[PDB]
């Protein structure tokens, strides 16, 4: 994150860190949606153009963290993955359409003050909250500029109207995507950045005081570039694939 701040403790209990075992290294962000399911971007696992293709044993899941680098001795839980599921139609060949994947944990994780799931939106929560001008929140351990934080960072951004989204780039934009960030005029800034990928973009409902995961940090052209916007996976739209795989 660029132009963010340090999160408070337990501010974002669904926040997960995708961690490489060897070399040990931060892979991506991700989110806890139940006691055995983790949601992330498909690009965190598979991107053939750069020879990326992680399998279950290449990875670890770290839940409950605050520090980027330290082993939070009785705070975090490390988990092994049972299986990885990628959208069957995620488009790595052109625009990262359907950038999404589920990770099933070997064993259920225990909730606590530092570990709690986020909700998945319903048609109506999507309807009333996904609107130009509303602000959502993004969190992650990525780069602080287009560099490495000591503690999880957080920024709040407004959603941007489709047209602008579109008029900002040459990539083909699908209904499975949305964009957020201020405008050059707005005189306010921030964005996701490298290493933030796969984290949650969240909203808090004003009707029930519950947090909802509206997007996954997908892609973007740089980090905080004037007249550019971060792009996110439309979680609501891919809800049916999610349900489908957990049911199944």
């Amino acid at each position: 994150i660029v132009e963010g701040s340090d999160a408070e403790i337990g501010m974002s209990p669904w926040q997960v860190m995708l961690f490489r075992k060897s070399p040990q290294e931060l892979l991506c962000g991700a989110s806890l949606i139940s006691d055995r399911w983790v949601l992330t971007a498909a690009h965190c696992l598979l991107y053939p153009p750069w020879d990326k293709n992680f399998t279950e044993n290449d990875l670890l899941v770290r839940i409950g963290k605050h520090s980027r680098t330290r082993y939070e001795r009785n705070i975090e839980k490390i988990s092994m993955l049972e299986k990885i599921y990628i959208h069957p139609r995620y488009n790595w060949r052109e625009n990262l359409d359907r950038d999404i994947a589920l990770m099933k944990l070997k064993k259920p994780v225990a909730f606590s003050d530092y570990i709690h799931p986020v909700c998945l939106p319903d048609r109506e929560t999507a309807a009333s909250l996904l609107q130009a001008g509303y602000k959502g929140r993004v969190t992650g351990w990525g780069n602080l500029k287009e560099g490495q934080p000591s503690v999880l960072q957080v920024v709040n951004l407004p959603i941007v109207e489709r047209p602008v989204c579109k008029d900002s780039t040459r990539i083909r934009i699908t209904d499975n995507m949305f964009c957020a960030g201020y405008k050059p005029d707005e005189g306010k800034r921030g964005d996701a950045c490298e290493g933030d990928s796969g984290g949650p973009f969240v909203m808090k409902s004003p009707f029930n005081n519950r947090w909802y995961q509206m997007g996954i940090v997908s892609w973007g052209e740089g980090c905080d570039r004037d007249g550019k916007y971060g792009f996110y996976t439309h979680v609501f739209r891919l809800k049916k694939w999610i349900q489908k795989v957990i049911d199944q």
Binding site: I9, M11, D113, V118, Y134, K135, R137, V154, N156, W211
Partner: peptide, 26 residues
């Protein structure tokens, strides 16, 4: 139980910037 944080929603404490989200919903 999803979406209610033990350290904020559960105890009724607000985080330092959630007000900005809420002030934006309209």
């Amino acid at each position: 139980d999803c979406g209610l944080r033990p350290l904020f929603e559960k105890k009724s404490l607000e985080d330092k910037t959630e007000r900005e989200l809420l002030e934006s919903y309209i």
